[PDB]
């Protein structure tokens, strides 16, 4: 029922920066938990960062300082600004939103850190 | 166990009077109330009168201001005085004893009939 | 008393009413169980198995006898209103005083039982009465099978069979005696209550309730190996002007959130009284509930006012699980939260939209001929009998942690208020 | 999603994760139980015991048949999307609507069952199928023992044996039928699910879960003395990106007091979702939990933020019992409240002091080679992978009386604030 | 420590005290159960039933063996203080560390058991010891009945009897093994603890407690079909200066309303400590409670002060059910709420009036010779030993909804206070 | 224990008005639930109106606008003012008061809407 | 019970097209969705396509924008159109019916093979 | 772990006064329950007085007015001032302190009321 | 299981000295404390002395400042030195081992008697 759209991926040079975005529309209202996952080709899916219901930020070991996550409740949009990219970051990034106990996944954008 | 023996039933002319007696024996110190019940042909038993150890007395709707009940603690007797009887009063009357723990005991039952007139 | 129509708009559904039958009085009858059967065989066969069986019964009879003998006594020892007895030293609650008075009432019965048991010792009937009823554990099986086996097979052959039969009975006795309900004893002896006691066509619900009443052990005899119990048979009476209603709460929508009105499973109306009912201990019949005592209890004033039609006072809580229903049929129509549940009218081809300010959608046969819940198309009932901006402000939490967290916030605001007062008094 | 490292400093320990297997779909198979065995003996032996056995079965078959016949009906009576039926009058929750739809789906099956039973009446096989499977109560014991006994012993000799065998079966039937879980029926007939149904090496955990799913009685036949049940066999599927974690809270020290973080026994992470899990109804395997539906539920925002690494928001409560642990091994090291528990490093000869401002001491193999808890010397694990002034202000109480006493204090402070306001308005 | 006299005025009744016996230490003895009996018959009779019986035992022995083998291990492998072992990876609470240390202590015992079992394989004694005790499932029944039957009846005749006897034992085994308490095993083998272990006249309460302690399975042998358990026998010691009191709360009247002081069922005093006791897991003897560990727990300061005689601090709640008593006998007199309960002095002819400002009426033998409760006349006890305007302000609610509704009112008053502050700051 | 007395019934002409009253005395104190029932001869008893503990009024279909109910806590009196009577209203009216879980019934007054 | 009969399997040249049909019979008013599943030698069954009573259609990752599915309610048939087949598409296809109460029913199964080319 | 020391006992004449004291040191902090017990030679131990957690005082029948008990939380000290002694008061007095569910006993001082 | 063997008992003159030894064998790494207990004719067993793995030692009321206990971890022995014996000290002494899980083990027991003098 809830439609998730994400944009901002694509080819990027090594050492550059990107700002992924993901918006939600439909019956979603109020503060909700949003997260960004990653899955390299031929590798299991892993979490990049998450914003809990109350705004408490969480970051993975690879995203402790290189990446930053933010939430815009009025627009139900989650942003992930990748300040410093490395060649191993090349993977598919998936947006996730949780409304109560229901978890909705979006069509993951692909990011290639070319060199 | 409380054993109840009834007496005083029979036939009576309409508008007459009758006295029904019920003798009790047993652990009566545990019995909360003593009274009389009635069953008519084709219906279940219904309460007629009851008297508590404190003398508080209640009657049925049809028995209010029409019948009376009394007790004698010394000779351990229960008496029912029937007055201003009607042709619809013919039935079977039972005396009962109710315990503080809601146990009920019934007598052998006596049939009271009234002439049509 | 209950505004069934308005409660539907807040998701509170009231089911079909049922009356109440209460046990105002009880008939008391004593049941004597004799655990040792009588083997009529003149060759004394089976005596060895009976001796072994006696040794096994001691593991149950002795614990019961010890428990009864060491039970505390609260009353120590005529006229229609004489003194029952003397108050024993200690503390005795109303339940213990009532239970003790019941044991005093059985004093005369115990004197009779002691004389009847002598005749039960030598009788060979399975069920006998002199009312006081006595049942022998396996006498029926012995007379119909073990007695005729001796005349055909050897004593050894069916002697072992008697052993296994008695062993099975011990396994059942320890299951029930190892409180006690009459259903257990009835099942143990495989005999109906109407077959045990010849006293009075009553509905299956009444017999099921009679089998549910507890039985108390009045005495145990270590010499005759017999146990006697006091059985109470209820006199059910219909309590006029008494109704028990079942309350079902569905999900209610508030700004795309899911809320529900927390209410007791059953609510009761008795004249001017309105409150919950603890039917968990009662039996539910086709048209009435059979209870041992009035199950009613007083509700919070906000819930009592909510059920009286003032739906603005109804308490509401967030739905935190899938247990709470999201749709329910009501009087031939469908009542559902059509935001989280897909509601379709006259076919799946169109979805009915529920405005965010409306919490529950009521769909009646006068509007939609067929209603589809999550694709489940259903035909509305033509015989069914199913625009106000209602706002509910009494938000409540069902767990102590949530209340504590909110209470900490209130305490912090109180400290800020006191500080602002101190500042105002100091500056002014 | 969970900051396992920071939670250790507040005494919250997260165990090894396990995935989740959920029953997305179920295969439906019908099981017919025929309670009367067939004695192939041409001399009609055992007929007397069977007649008596029939009388005993009535005590179970009749109550079940009466309960089914008097059960309320919520749907009253093609195409891929036709109307299922008509909404019956009354109130029916989603659970009852779902259960009723399941009984409607069995309408075609019931018509088939009525024809199969005719062949089951005269067959003498213990387990037979035509899938629909039928099992006779004691046919296996009769064929292997009671049938050959007639040819060697007299009819009387082993006739009594058949009686005791049937009596044992009745004691087992009344234990399970007196909801119903497939494990009960499997144990009653002493037969494995793989032997009953020939449908598909699966782990013991999967079979244990299949034996845990409930079975519903679709019909009872009083003439053939047979009961039929609908058995659901689950199709387990691994729910990707789903993890269930076990949470263990140890004692936490605050100014020589003992506190602990109250958290659910199990917590779950599913993509962006974080919350508790009700695994009490699930089966725990070596690497996953097998559940009938998503056990997740929404937690309080303070607990969700606490588990997300913001340990300053964690709720804390006073330790009022010895149930709460005071020490626990974590990833090859020891995590304990070394104030109330004696912690020793490299031997009992020296005790490690925990400053009053530190709540939990974390001891790793990089510091102490051996750790002694209350004198229990343990060797640290070399392969294990185990200075911030954290303050927790969200004090919470787990009992309603404590909250009420604190709420009364807040109300008294509110009255004083209102009085001070009245004084200020009157004087100023 | 408790002001029993003042608590009566608020309806709190303290029963007769009892000491406490605590299990400071346990004796450990191992019990080996051999499920396969030995049939001494040289004609190999009964072998077919034993083969079938073995197949049935697998349904229990295999699940137990699989559960033990797959159990997680938290310690992996001398001197009086050497290292017990190495911490295994994972998370292990104090309970698991303690349980694991117990299994390590049994390592030497297991090496002995493996040698004793060889002699148990060929012995034919029902109970044998070499302490380690071994019991054969039905060896006593076999030797006393099935062994002599072969010499008189045919092998076929009593061969079927052995089958039914073994079948009964399986039904009992699956009842207890399908935690485990020693009472279950004692009942299964129909043998007393004093007959099993010859170690030390003790009261029935001590044996009942010994039969209540749990037993743990240390190993299972699939070849010999034997199960061994570790039995702990407690060494009871009387804890000096320890008292357990039972607290009974009666209805208390406040302005024609009914209130009661909510208190734990049992309260304990141990020197300077005063608090509740969780006796639900303990055994109650004639003069003491037998507990596995100190059942005490810390109470709220208001309840601790209430029990210390400061009755103005006692929490009070509205009576919402008939469960709460309205009258109770205390030390030979009657303590009751004589407003809702009819109290009569020296006969029913006069009712004692209780002023609305008095909550509980205390009637002593010095005033009324006979006391009548609802017409139940009772004689006062001459040996019994049974004007202050007390006010209780600590009103408390036992349900979360009531607290939430009151908390919402407090929050609304806080908002009004903040608004009045804003108005004062803006105008002034 | 609680005595209930009701007054104000009797004969009344069609289209007139009446004000039934019912007072309670004894151990009754504070706010309590009060209700008025009705039972026509040869018909089952039905509820007319009720006042809950918190003052929330309730009315039956026949009493939605024709009848009004009020409570006087200081006098423990419940009033039922029948503004517009109809011939079918002729029946016995019973006062009911609930104190906790106990329900007390009064001796019902009779109202006859003559014509 | 819902009986499913499959048809249309066999051998096909790579790059060709095939039409698979599945006929259903029973209490289809209770079936929520109809679709097709695939098993390959050496792996478990996987979803291929499914269509609900409302016409909502979903496909697998490998079937997205490559295959199609359709239904005919009047003649009670389920049709699967296979186009742009690849050598890796050789497998056994099954048609299934899913009930509102999560009951699943499977057909007899048909084998689809594609020439190597 | 908690060390309890008590002082102030010894020989005393009949009719005189004494002030027993008992201090606690170690992990004890905050308000705690303190009590004083007594045990005559050849007699069971009995309680003299107790101070609960919240400061509610308790006294035995023999200590209702003759004895007074006080607590000093800042010093974790409990005092028992025996204002009027009698010859039967000759016994051993034991200090008791409760920290949670744990009860600690001190080495009891002896008081002899000589005459 | 921990096996305990006692030695050093017998007869001694009043005012003399005696040395009692107890040898332990088994999983002693699990034993929390080792000590000695005493039973006198006509009364239950009472604690005499105990020493923990850390060397912390406690004594009975009658043994305080009068007896001593010691251990040798290398040769795995428990020694009890008895000095300033009294005529009331004649009894049976046992050595015990207490486990961290509260399991207790007892030795065979040795009788110690003192002459009246």
mmCIF file of C-alpha atoms in Angstrom, chain D residues 54-315:
data_model
loop_
_atom_site.group_PDB
_atom_site.id
_atom_site.type_symbol
_atom_site.label_atom_id
_atom_site.label_comp_id
_atom_site.label_asym_id
_atom_site.label_seq_id
_atom_site.Cartn_x
_atom_site.Cartn_y
_atom_site.Cartn_z
ATOM 1 C CA UNK D 54 -19.237 -48.872 22.671
ATOM 2 C CA UNK D 55 -21.217 -47.847 25.765
ATOM 3 C CA UNK D 56 -18.065 -46.296 27.237
ATOM 4 C CA UNK D 57 -17.149 -44.368 24.074
ATOM 5 C CA UNK D 58 -20.553 -42.638 24.174
ATOM 6 C CA UNK D 59 -19.322 -40.628 27.175
ATOM 7 C CA UNK D 60 -16.920 -38.883 24.746
ATOM 8 C CA UNK D 61 -18.477 -39.153 21.277
ATOM 9 C CA UNK D 62 -21.851 -37.722 22.374
ATOM 10 C CA UNK D 63 -20.399 -34.607 24.099
ATOM 11 C CA UNK D 64 -18.303 -33.852 21.004
ATOM 12 C CA UNK D 65 -21.231 -34.358 18.618
ATOM 13 C CA UNK D 66 -23.500 -32.160 20.750
ATOM 14 C CA UNK D 67 -20.872 -29.413 20.930
ATOM 15 C CA UNK D 68 -20.386 -29.416 17.159
ATOM 16 C CA UNK D 69 -24.104 -29.503 16.329
ATOM 17 C CA UNK D 70 -24.913 -26.606 18.684
ATOM 18 C CA UNK D 71 -21.971 -24.457 17.550
ATOM 19 C CA UNK D 72 -23.028 -21.045 16.255
ATOM 20 C CA UNK D 73 -22.989 -20.520 12.484
ATOM 21 C CA UNK D 74 -21.758 -17.195 11.090
ATOM 22 C CA UNK D 75 -21.944 -17.965 7.340
ATOM 23 C CA UNK D 76 -24.935 -19.580 5.619
ATOM 24 C CA UNK D 77 -24.904 -20.862 2.043
ATOM 25 C CA UNK D 78 -18.912 -21.320 -9.031
ATOM 26 C CA UNK D 79 -16.287 -18.739 -9.978
ATOM 27 C CA UNK D 80 -12.734 -17.824 -9.019
ATOM 28 C CA UNK D 81 -14.175 -14.808 -7.180
ATOM 29 C CA UNK D 82 -17.788 -15.628 -6.386
ATOM 30 C CA UNK D 83 -19.581 -14.835 -3.150
ATOM 31 C CA UNK D 84 -18.602 -17.266 -0.396
ATOM 32 C CA UNK D 85 -21.981 -17.020 1.303
ATOM 33 C CA UNK D 86 -24.345 -14.753 3.201
ATOM 34 C CA UNK D 87 -23.480 -12.957 6.436
ATOM 35 C CA UNK D 88 -25.413 -14.566 9.271
ATOM 36 C CA UNK D 89 -27.046 -12.393 11.905
ATOM 37 C CA UNK D 90 -25.048 -11.693 15.065
ATOM 38 C CA UNK D 91 -21.507 -10.510 15.735
ATOM 39 C CA UNK D 92 -18.559 -12.402 14.243
ATOM 40 C CA UNK D 93 -14.950 -11.333 14.746
ATOM 41 C CA UNK D 94 -12.189 -11.815 12.182
ATOM 42 C CA UNK D 95 -11.088 -15.054 13.861
ATOM 43 C CA UNK D 96 -14.602 -16.494 13.555
ATOM 44 C CA UNK D 97 -14.917 -15.322 9.943
ATOM 45 C CA UNK D 98 -11.595 -16.993 9.102
ATOM 46 C CA UNK D 99 -12.525 -20.210 10.926
ATOM 47 C CA UNK D 100 -15.924 -20.285 9.199
ATOM 48 C CA UNK D 101 -14.329 -19.817 5.766
ATOM 49 C CA UNK D 102 -12.120 -22.816 6.554
ATOM 50 C CA UNK D 103 -15.200 -24.940 7.305
ATOM 51 C CA UNK D 104 -16.756 -23.814 4.012
ATOM 52 C CA UNK D 105 -13.626 -24.953 2.161
ATOM 53 C CA UNK D 106 -14.174 -28.419 3.686
ATOM 54 C CA UNK D 107 -17.695 -28.748 2.235
ATOM 55 C CA UNK D 108 -16.443 -30.640 -0.827
ATOM 56 C CA UNK D 109 -14.166 -32.796 1.340
ATOM 57 C CA UNK D 110 -17.057 -33.808 3.614
ATOM 58 C CA UNK D 111 -18.966 -35.125 0.587
ATOM 59 C CA UNK D 112 -15.971 -37.352 -0.232
ATOM 60 C CA UNK D 113 -15.496 -38.557 3.367
ATOM 61 C CA UNK D 114 -19.096 -39.822 3.481
ATOM 62 C CA UNK D 115 -18.264 -42.276 0.673
ATOM 63 C CA UNK D 116 -14.857 -43.413 1.963
ATOM 64 C CA UNK D 117 -16.207 -44.362 5.411
ATOM 65 C CA UNK D 118 -18.244 -47.194 3.865
ATOM 66 C CA UNK D 119 -15.023 -49.005 2.920
ATOM 67 C CA UNK D 120 -13.457 -48.314 6.335
ATOM 68 C CA UNK D 121 -16.356 -50.110 8.051
ATOM 69 C CA UNK D 122 -15.340 -53.582 6.825
ATOM 70 C CA UNK D 123 -11.580 -53.196 6.388
ATOM 71 C CA UNK D 124 -9.171 -54.744 8.900
ATOM 72 C CA UNK D 125 -6.030 -52.700 8.184
ATOM 73 C CA UNK D 126 -4.497 -50.664 10.994
ATOM 74 C CA UNK D 127 -3.616 -47.704 8.748
ATOM 75 C CA UNK D 128 -5.284 -47.343 5.356
ATOM 76 C CA UNK D 129 -5.423 -44.568 2.773
ATOM 77 C CA UNK D 130 -7.404 -44.067 -0.422
ATOM 78 C CA UNK D 131 -4.948 -38.135 0.500
ATOM 79 C CA UNK D 132 -7.280 -39.283 3.280
ATOM 80 C CA UNK D 133 -5.829 -41.584 5.947
ATOM 81 C CA UNK D 134 -7.805 -43.783 8.346
ATOM 82 C CA UNK D 135 -6.508 -45.415 11.533
ATOM 83 C CA UNK D 136 -8.282 -48.069 13.601
ATOM 84 C CA UNK D 137 -7.873 -47.730 17.368
ATOM 85 C CA UNK D 138 -6.485 -51.164 18.292
ATOM 86 C CA UNK D 139 -6.606 -53.115 15.016
ATOM 87 C CA UNK D 140 -2.838 -53.698 15.081
ATOM 88 C CA UNK D 141 -2.943 -55.199 18.586
ATOM 89 C CA UNK D 142 -5.992 -57.298 17.663
ATOM 90 C CA UNK D 143 -4.464 -58.757 14.488
ATOM 91 C CA UNK D 144 -1.048 -59.492 16.011
ATOM 92 C CA UNK D 145 -2.265 -60.860 19.366
ATOM 93 C CA UNK D 146 -6.026 -61.221 19.893
ATOM 94 C CA UNK D 147 -6.576 -62.849 16.488
ATOM 95 C CA UNK D 148 -3.956 -65.620 17.048
ATOM 96 C CA UNK D 149 -5.053 -66.119 20.683
ATOM 97 C CA UNK D 150 -8.463 -67.462 19.640
ATOM 98 C CA UNK D 151 -6.720 -70.277 17.766
ATOM 99 C CA UNK D 152 -4.689 -71.286 20.846
ATOM 100 C CA UNK D 153 -6.502 -70.107 23.982
ATOM 101 C CA UNK D 154 -10.217 -70.133 24.614
ATOM 102 C CA UNK D 155 -12.422 -67.216 23.659
ATOM 103 C CA UNK D 156 -12.955 -66.486 27.357
ATOM 104 C CA UNK D 157 -9.231 -66.417 28.203
ATOM 105 C CA UNK D 158 -8.186 -63.663 25.793
ATOM 106 C CA UNK D 159 -11.649 -62.106 25.666
ATOM 107 C CA UNK D 160 -10.932 -60.504 29.033
ATOM 108 C CA UNK D 161 -7.556 -59.370 27.680
ATOM 109 C CA UNK D 162 -9.276 -57.523 24.834
ATOM 110 C CA UNK D 163 -11.419 -55.797 27.455
ATOM 111 C CA UNK D 164 -8.430 -54.461 29.381
ATOM 112 C CA UNK D 165 -6.723 -53.383 26.153
ATOM 113 C CA UNK D 166 -9.792 -51.403 25.082
ATOM 114 C CA UNK D 167 -10.113 -49.952 28.593
ATOM 115 C CA UNK D 168 -6.560 -48.602 28.347
ATOM 116 C CA UNK D 169 -7.346 -46.975 24.995
ATOM 117 C CA UNK D 170 -10.387 -45.249 26.505
ATOM 118 C CA UNK D 171 -8.229 -43.800 29.284
ATOM 119 C CA UNK D 172 -5.950 -42.311 26.623
ATOM 120 C CA UNK D 173 -8.794 -41.028 24.416
ATOM 121 C CA UNK D 174 -10.421 -39.193 27.328
ATOM 122 C CA UNK D 175 -7.038 -37.659 28.180
ATOM 123 C CA UNK D 176 -6.765 -35.925 24.789
ATOM 124 C CA UNK D 177 -10.455 -35.499 23.858
ATOM 125 C CA UNK D 178 -11.804 -34.962 27.384
ATOM 126 C CA UNK D 179 -7.775 -27.446 21.948
ATOM 127 C CA UNK D 180 -6.384 -30.603 20.342
ATOM 128 C CA UNK D 181 -2.804 -30.758 19.061
ATOM 129 C CA UNK D 182 -1.526 -33.265 16.503
ATOM 130 C CA UNK D 183 1.099 -34.419 19.018
ATOM 131 C CA UNK D 184 -1.723 -35.768 21.174
ATOM 132 C CA UNK D 185 -3.197 -37.884 18.386
ATOM 133 C CA UNK D 186 0.247 -39.052 17.254
ATOM 134 C CA UNK D 187 1.013 -40.170 20.813
ATOM 135 C CA UNK D 188 -2.417 -41.777 21.227
ATOM 136 C CA UNK D 189 -1.910 -43.968 18.155
ATOM 137 C CA UNK D 190 1.861 -44.371 18.745
ATOM 138 C CA UNK D 191 2.525 -43.555 15.081
ATOM 139 C CA UNK D 192 4.821 -41.000 13.448
ATOM 140 C CA UNK D 193 3.566 -38.251 11.141
ATOM 141 C CA UNK D 194 5.798 -39.627 8.374
ATOM 142 C CA UNK D 195 4.088 -43.007 8.778
ATOM 143 C CA UNK D 196 0.588 -41.500 8.676
ATOM 144 C CA UNK D 197 1.040 -39.193 5.671
ATOM 145 C CA UNK D 198 3.335 -40.133 2.775
ATOM 146 C CA UNK D 199 4.060 -36.566 1.711
ATOM 147 C CA UNK D 200 7.055 -34.238 1.650
ATOM 148 C CA UNK D 201 14.872 -35.731 5.767
ATOM 149 C CA UNK D 202 13.422 -32.689 7.513
ATOM 150 C CA UNK D 203 14.939 -31.708 10.841
ATOM 151 C CA UNK D 204 13.452 -32.833 14.149
ATOM 152 C CA UNK D 205 12.502 -29.193 14.771
ATOM 153 C CA UNK D 206 10.224 -29.150 11.716
ATOM 154 C CA UNK D 207 8.418 -32.333 12.772
ATOM 155 C CA UNK D 208 8.075 -31.019 16.330
ATOM 156 C CA UNK D 209 6.422 -27.879 14.944
ATOM 157 C CA UNK D 210 4.101 -29.890 12.688
ATOM 158 C CA UNK D 211 3.025 -31.891 15.744
ATOM 159 C CA UNK D 212 2.338 -28.581 17.531
ATOM 160 C CA UNK D 213 -0.218 -27.199 15.051
ATOM 161 C CA UNK D 214 -3.815 -27.552 16.230
ATOM 162 C CA UNK D 215 -6.365 -29.843 14.566
ATOM 163 C CA UNK D 216 -10.109 -29.180 14.313
ATOM 164 C CA UNK D 217 -12.944 -31.712 14.358
ATOM 165 C CA UNK D 218 -14.981 -31.389 11.166
ATOM 166 C CA UNK D 219 -17.577 -34.095 11.894
ATOM 167 C CA UNK D 220 -18.523 -36.994 14.172
ATOM 168 C CA UNK D 221 -20.437 -40.129 13.138
ATOM 169 C CA UNK D 222 -22.587 -41.741 15.842
ATOM 170 C CA UNK D 223 -23.390 -44.833 13.745
ATOM 171 C CA UNK D 224 -19.901 -45.905 12.643
ATOM 172 C CA UNK D 225 -18.275 -44.546 15.837
ATOM 173 C CA UNK D 226 -15.687 -42.527 13.945
ATOM 174 C CA UNK D 227 -14.200 -39.055 14.375
ATOM 175 C CA UNK D 228 -12.529 -37.096 11.575
ATOM 176 C CA UNK D 229 -10.105 -34.190 11.956
ATOM 177 C CA UNK D 230 -8.544 -31.683 9.564
ATOM 178 C CA UNK D 231 -4.739 -31.699 9.816
ATOM 179 C CA UNK D 232 -2.709 -28.742 8.537
ATOM 180 C CA UNK D 233 0.874 -29.428 7.454
ATOM 181 C CA UNK D 234 2.994 -26.259 7.314
ATOM 182 C CA UNK D 235 5.200 -25.110 4.445
ATOM 183 C CA UNK D 236 8.072 -23.414 6.266
ATOM 184 C CA UNK D 237 9.887 -20.554 4.518
ATOM 185 C CA UNK D 238 12.876 -18.601 5.819
ATOM 186 C CA UNK D 239 11.995 -14.916 6.253
ATOM 187 C CA UNK D 240 15.027 -13.088 4.858
ATOM 188 C CA UNK D 241 16.459 -10.112 6.784
ATOM 189 C CA UNK D 242 14.699 -11.303 9.959
ATOM 190 C CA UNK D 243 16.616 -11.838 13.208
ATOM 191 C CA UNK D 244 15.469 -12.777 16.712
ATOM 192 C CA UNK D 245 17.748 -11.861 19.625
ATOM 193 C CA UNK D 246 17.601 -12.954 23.266
ATOM 194 C CA UNK D 247 18.052 -10.177 25.839
ATOM 195 C CA UNK D 248 19.465 -10.860 29.312
ATOM 196 C CA UNK D 249 19.641 -8.056 31.886
ATOM 197 C CA UNK D 250 22.139 -8.162 34.737
ATOM 198 C CA UNK D 251 22.270 -6.007 37.862
ATOM 199 C CA UNK D 252 23.545 -2.454 37.348
ATOM 200 C CA UNK D 253 25.063 -0.397 40.169
ATOM 201 C CA UNK D 254 24.056 3.205 40.914
ATOM 202 C CA UNK D 255 25.425 4.680 44.167
ATOM 203 C CA UNK D 256 25.608 1.243 45.857
ATOM 204 C CA UNK D 257 22.018 0.476 44.796
ATOM 205 C CA UNK D 258 21.191 -2.347 42.386
ATOM 206 C CA UNK D 259 19.225 -1.484 39.244
ATOM 207 C CA UNK D 260 18.371 -3.375 36.068
ATOM 208 C CA UNK D 261 17.069 -2.462 32.611
ATOM 209 C CA UNK D 262 13.646 -4.140 32.130
ATOM 210 C CA UNK D 263 13.472 -5.508 28.589
ATOM 211 C CA UNK D 264 11.517 -8.242 26.792
ATOM 212 C CA UNK D 265 12.972 -11.740 26.847
ATOM 213 C CA UNK D 266 13.333 -11.664 23.049
ATOM 214 C CA UNK D 267 13.739 -8.747 20.638
ATOM 215 C CA UNK D 268 13.465 -8.814 16.851
ATOM 216 C CA UNK D 269 14.972 -6.821 13.982
ATOM 217 C CA UNK D 270 13.293 -6.947 10.552
ATOM 218 C CA UNK D 271 14.713 -4.400 8.139
ATOM 219 C CA UNK D 272 13.796 -1.051 9.666
ATOM 220 C CA UNK D 273 11.674 -2.646 12.415
ATOM 221 C CA UNK D 274 12.936 -3.218 15.960
ATOM 222 C CA UNK D 275 10.736 -4.700 18.661
ATOM 223 C CA UNK D 276 9.965 -7.560 20.979
ATOM 224 C CA UNK D 277 9.055 -11.079 19.902
ATOM 225 C CA UNK D 278 6.500 -13.427 21.493
ATOM 226 C CA UNK D 279 8.449 -16.646 20.945
ATOM 227 C CA UNK D 280 6.458 -18.403 23.699
ATOM 228 C CA UNK D 281 4.255 -19.915 20.962
ATOM 229 C CA UNK D 282 7.188 -20.744 18.651
ATOM 230 C CA UNK D 283 9.707 -23.586 18.399
ATOM 231 C CA UNK D 284 13.421 -22.823 18.782
ATOM 232 C CA UNK D 285 15.720 -24.720 16.421
ATOM 233 C CA UNK D 286 19.513 -24.750 16.142
ATOM 234 C CA UNK D 287 19.613 -21.828 13.693
ATOM 235 C CA UNK D 288 16.090 -20.382 13.460
ATOM 236 C CA UNK D 289 12.766 -19.933 15.219
ATOM 237 C CA UNK D 290 9.711 -21.604 13.686
ATOM 238 C CA UNK D 291 6.612 -19.471 14.208
ATOM 239 C CA UNK D 292 3.025 -19.621 12.922
ATOM 240 C CA UNK D 293 2.985 -15.848 12.317
ATOM 241 C CA UNK D 294 5.225 -12.839 12.856
ATOM 242 C CA UNK D 295 5.733 -12.657 16.657
ATOM 243 C CA UNK D 296 6.901 -9.041 16.534
ATOM 244 C CA UNK D 297 5.209 -6.267 18.480
ATOM 245 C CA UNK D 298 5.876 -2.544 18.845
ATOM 246 C CA UNK D 299 7.978 -1.431 21.822
ATOM 247 C CA UNK D 300 8.000 1.841 23.725
ATOM 248 C CA UNK D 301 10.061 4.560 22.034
ATOM 249 C CA UNK D 302 12.392 4.738 25.050
ATOM 250 C CA UNK D 303 13.202 1.026 24.779
ATOM 251 C CA UNK D 304 13.573 1.252 20.994
ATOM 252 C CA UNK D 305 16.000 4.159 21.403
ATOM 253 C CA UNK D 306 17.811 2.337 24.223
ATOM 254 C CA UNK D 307 18.436 -0.666 21.964
ATOM 255 C CA UNK D 308 19.545 1.687 19.160
ATOM 256 C CA UNK D 309 22.569 2.749 21.234
ATOM 257 C CA UNK D 310 21.126 5.758 23.095
ATOM 258 C CA UNK D 311 21.736 4.080 26.447
ATOM 259 C CA UNK D 312 20.850 7.279 28.321
ATOM 260 C CA UNK D 313 17.175 6.566 27.529
ATOM 261 C CA UNK D 314 17.137 3.009 28.906
ATOM 262 C CA UNK D 315 14.458 2.463 31.584
#
